[model samples]
Target: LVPRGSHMMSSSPCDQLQSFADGDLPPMEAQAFGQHLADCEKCQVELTRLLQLDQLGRGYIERHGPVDIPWHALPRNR
Candidate 1:
């Protein structure tokens, strides 16, 4: 929770993008974040960027297939 006297208002949901995107926040906090997103243009844009990045990463992996590594290059446990 933000301090009562601080200059920061409660519209700082941008910091919680990963939690919001992953649905990791608690129910009440999620509701609050959703409300903030509804009204905050900055956070809405930020969320869009996060979503686009996620989609781009997924698309790249889907098109490229799984990564392959040579077994001989891996280090063995002592």
Candidate 2:
């Protein structure tokens, strides 16, 4: 969960957008975030940006294919 101070009102709703988009937050929390979105243009813009990034990433992968890495070549931590 995203960390917040004592008051939910004190936190930026943008901080919750990822969890909100992922549907990982509880219903009450999602409702609170949705209510915040209704009033907060800044959070709305941020949510749009997040969604755009998701779409862009998908488009990129669809055009160029998924990235692959040689995991065996990487050094492991002791």
Q: What would the TM-scores of all predictions be?
A: 0.44, 0.45
lDDT tens digits, residue span 1-72, model 2: 887678645666767877776557886688786766676777777677767766665435445667687868
> How do the residues 1-78 of candidate 1 rate in per-residue lDDT, one tens digit apiece?
655675755646766765777557776688676665666767777777767766665435445567776878647866
State the TM-score for model 1: 0.44
Candidate 2, residue 75: how far the Cα is off, in Å: 53
Error of 1 at 11 (Å): 8.3
Off by over 4 Å in 1: 1-11, 57-78
Q: Candidate 2 regions off by >4 Å? A: 1-10, 57-78
Which lDDT value does model 2 have at 1? 81
Candidate 2 lDDT trough over 10 residues, lowest sum: 54-63
